[PDB]
């Protein structure tokens, strides 16, 4: 085997971001297998043909189940909303196909448990799976993980993380699927809270032990998708059934305090994923709106010169950067997807289980469920270890 | 009446920062009364005499109660730890002396209630009082309040605030009174949590309704200045909802390695947002959500224009101010309130409401339950 | 015609950056013609075949002249060093091929004049040409141009620009082609000075009228490419024949003062292209290491709230951004190349002359020549209007 | 000897900023001599008496020459425009008075030469003098000098400096003495160009060798405080080489719309780089080029540690300082130099070398020729 046949399900949701990664990866990195964009799945035959020509896929299929039967599909990339992840990923693994699944892993803990079980059985048969928490593959974030691994942070006292967006801060913005509890599973919590739960656990190497949470919906009714705005009446609106924001306190198993905030109503903030970790030997700070920077404070340095150093994460020694451009020639949102592909293809070729695993996705799911339950119950909730 | 005699108690705690304000205020601002630095109080006779020479005070007294009798003390500035705030401030008010008292107002809600009760009765008799939440008088913070008052923020959805310091992040840093519950009341919570509770409430003009909190002590014993116990929190974190509906997220800690006095506030509303960091004290960032998306963004307002609060007393644009200036501004406002027959803000009633927030956070931590704040 | 056949010369220099643009442009933008990556040119047949498979080109040719004969080449992309631009671009235009040429336009004013003449004759016959000053197509930069065009800056008093890099700040870094006067034409001046001359003229819409300049070489000898470092002797080094840094004062035709600095010895600065323009109605500030931001001060705003606003250049109303990702989902160095392609393909389809033209490239060349002459002569030099 | 009597000339120009320094220095620093604010000079009797009350001066004099006779004036602080610096400072030195003189040292090189000559002779007789380039005493700038002295920057390749202000960017802003060549000597060049010339030379420890300059006046006539001519430059830009080989690029202007007091300096060397902006005064950024590329970068040093220059006199970490503090630091250093029998820096000789740089830039502009600076 020199090539790895790819089939993608969910082009309407993440097709552009995922497809560019499959196209670019072997051009910028020397991969042990060449990914072939073989099959794009979609029920609307004319729309999926159009998408296939735009995105670079050779054939299309109406029925996702067909991808699991085709010898030219070795790996299924599942990009749909959480409500369909368990059905599709479990089937794919049982059909002997490697799987890349978007986050969050599922819509319920029960689903995620079933996925983790299937992933374990599959791994025993050489069939690999990964949950695509893309921001782990931002070079600055991978660098932060390395600095912790190298011991430069020491005993972690504090984790603080915010994921601040504003894309529905306007109450007149209409209803859609990310606002429908049934497809999306949750709102801010599941969509963007998941990212920061996973990023903080990834960087520290520690896990959240207990949480105290509050979910809020600021705008509970919104114009229906084709409401009439005349010279919008009350009868033209429908209910919002997910959270607009989720906030929570945490303790980590190692003892650190954590403070988390994810919202779609942070007016002026667009994709501001903010993380700061404070430990006995140093601290790290990151903001995705400055994605190419990692700030690092060394607490062992002479107080005369100690301070957060601005590390421009564009050196060839930084994770992934060697595949791209010279120092100061910035990367962006899309590169992390390519880096995922590089790491997934490489794991498959080397017979290794990719990270984050479905088991890792399940633990994240358990944190999300605990925050939600904590909000409704008004009680702290422990996370199964 | 042209002069206002001042007596100060607690020089060893805040003596330098308060004295520079009393000295500077009439030189930089045209005040309706001239503050006279008349009496410095301290029980160590040699130490208080030295401090009086250094700090600009004309006479000294061993017994704080003597300030209550002296005709040349019109106003008592109380800078001791919270354990002594109630006894001193209430006596002073009852003796017909105006009072400035440091934060937090007291060590317990019951003490704060007695203080606010005395202040209310005293104010009806023309005797003024103020609690010194100094960061209100940072020009950028006063400007933030003004932008809210002008309607530029709209319906507030989020309040986030952090007060990040690292001064005891070293486990071998020694005990002091700030680590002693019997002196300070609490640790991070009362010392720096109080500041951000008050700052967010002041800027928004709204009040916290309920909280969920957790206090933590990372280092439980330290060297004496032999070793002893740390009996307060090193950090306090809490969720909040505000009466107007906003979600709040608060974090105050002495263990944020690399952060020195980072008071960070962001407020997000339907019409705009504000952001501030004290380590960039001279800046306020303001995003106008009603602006064309082509150019909408947080604008960096350098708070050094003569139209900005207090700045006209000082230096030209870009000629930065710092930590000490807010104390002078406190003095300007307090002296002017007294002269004009007005009650200064924050009032002891305001101080009491903050105390109730602090008590709720602490009680939430131990009980593991959400706690409502009385109105 | 629905397709536009591309041939690229100079893959070893800019092949990755240019090829990704030709591949991505029709996938992210709805182009009036589809660019086909038909021919990659290179004299080393085995190396160019390898490059063609990596970069996405269908065939290769040994002799660049062959591209000018092929009916499947409509447009020649010239990526080589300045020393070959005039020979290749003039020939291409005379063969009826559209041309994209890298900056600077040439190595001498005489060459650039010959290129501008050929471009004029070609344009009369419907054959288009552009000089690829890529940073004009950074969305923040295009936005800055729009704000000026909209009148928001007013009378310009000051232009300040720096291009700060450090890639040869180490004296032991060895000799190469960008250090050889004969291929490169100059060092910092021609390489990175050209970028800031053009960016400031583009944004303001004004031209430099006179300059006072100084060129410097800090490290005049460097280890030869295969020098022996034993237990590096003096005999193992060779001379550096270009400038390491170029600084100059300018006045603009409208009256503004300009202050320019380009260097390869700004230790710690990687690709920091810094521009600030101050005018009667407002000011603009930009730093490529924060490429996704434009800072804009409105001088007509109430002093109570006037200040530089941080514009995150990721709204769909900002130039080019609609083709990419949602707000806060950052772009990077590579996107400007794609935007060049979009604008070039669109100009060709619409029968318009692309900007910057070869004539615009010539005027830049005249500024560069004046700075160099000013340095040697120790006298101010006027730029032909 | 325990006290040092001060007399100040030029209150209407720098009276507030200099007086706060003389008042504050002994309260925050343990000084070997106590400065006594004894005499304020001014020809308008009522105005100078009011200012003396405001600013803390015990007596007043109409004639500046009277300060030269009075035994309670040991040190003359000269704050007038440059047109009067030479006459006053030389007379004071000759009368056996120590001198602090504002920048630039004078209006002409010839005047600066006479001042430096008098200062040299006076210093041999124990009479000290200093030119007040105040920004040297910003803690972050003093730290920058220390990092250079420690060898952390190595061989300097680049110096870039800007002093960006906008206070007369409005064409209708009125004339003042700062726009009058006969009072100020020059405009942006002498007022703010001088600061960045001295700052870069001080930090690097090197001197400018040659310059190519251009001065521009954007608004040539303005309203009086009827209209009159602006007889100075609004902006001064110049290239430089330093004696050690570095290239320098300098820009000073009053027309940088949106910039208020943005003094920006960056120094790039073989072993590291430094960057500073006064609008972020409490920060110094330091890049160590000898660091592993995995983590190399400019570190943000908050200049509020007790090991940083002067900071031990003030407030805890993160408790920011501002513009006024450098004046106090000047006083600390000047009083201590006098007490210890040392010559303070910058000296009048240092002031003269800066004057020669300014003269060269101006002469370069008019002649359109590069100009060398004498050593």
From TrEMBL, chains A, C:
GO terms for molecular function: nucleotide binding; oxidoreductase activity. Gene3D superfamilies: Dihydrodipicolinate Reductase, domain 2 (3.30.360.10), NAD(P)-binding Rossmann-like Domain (3.40.50.720). Residues 143-284 form the GFO/IDH/MocA-like oxidoreductase domain. It comes from the Bacteria. This is Oxidoreductase domain protein. Keywords: Oxidoreductase. It comes from Kribbella flavida (strain DSM 17836 / JCM 10339 / NBRC 14399). The keyword Cytoplasm does not apply. Residues 5-122 form the Gfo/Idh/MocA-like oxidoreductase N-terminal domain. The keyword Lyase does not apply. Pfam families: GFO_IDH_MocA, GFO_IDH_MocA_C3.
């Amino acid at each position: 085997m020199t090539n790895l046949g790819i089939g993608l399900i969910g082009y309407a949701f993440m097709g552009a971001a995922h497809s560019q990664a499959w196209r670019s990866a072997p051009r910028f990195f020397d991969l042990p297998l060449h990914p072939d964009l073989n099959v794009l799945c979609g029920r609307d035959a004319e729309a999926v043909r159009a998408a296939a020509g735009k995105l670079g896929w050779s054939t299309t299929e109406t029925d996702w189940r067909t991808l699991l039967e085709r010898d030219d599909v070795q790996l299924v990339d599942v990009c749909t909303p959480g409500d369909s992840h368990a059905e599709i990923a479990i089937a794919a693994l049982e059909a002997g196909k490697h799987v890349l699944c978007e986050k969050p892993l599922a819509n319920t803990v029960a689903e995620a448990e079933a996925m983790a079980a299937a992933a374990a059985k599959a791994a025993a048969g050489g069939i690999r799976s990964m949950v695509g928490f893309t921001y782990r593959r931002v070079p600055a974030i991978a660098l932060a993980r390395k600095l912790v691994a190298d011991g430069k942070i020491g005993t972690v006292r504090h984790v603080r993380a915010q994921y601040l967006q504003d894309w529905i801060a306007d109450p007149e913005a209409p209803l859609s699927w990310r606002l429908d509890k049934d497809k999306a599973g949750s709102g801010a919590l599941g969509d963007i809270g998941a990212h920061i739960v996973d990023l903080t656990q990834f960087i520290t190497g520690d896990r959240i032990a207990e949480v105290s949470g509050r979910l809020e919906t600021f705008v509970k009714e919104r114009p229906k998708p084709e409401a009439h705005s005349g010279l919008t009446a009350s009868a033209e609106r429908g209910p919002v059934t997910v959270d607009d924001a989720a906030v929570f306190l945490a303790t980590f198993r190692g003892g650190a305090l954590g403070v988390f905030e994810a919202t779609r109503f942070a007016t002026g903030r667009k994709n501001a994923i903010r993380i700061e970790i404070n430990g006995s030997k140093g601290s790290l700070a990151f903001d995705f709106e400055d994605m190419n920077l990692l700030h690092f404070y060394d607490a062992t340095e002479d107080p005369e010169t100690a301070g957060f150093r601005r590390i421009l994460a564009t050196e060839p020694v930084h994770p992934y950067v060697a595949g791209w451009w010279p120092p100061g020639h910035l990367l962006g949102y899309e590169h992390g997807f390519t880096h995922q592909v590089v790491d997934l293809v490489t794991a498959i070729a080397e017979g290794k289980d990719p990270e984050p695993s479905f088991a890792d996705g399940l633990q994240v799911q358990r944190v999300l469920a605990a925050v939600e339950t904590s909000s409704t119950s008004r009680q702290w909730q422990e996370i199964p270890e």
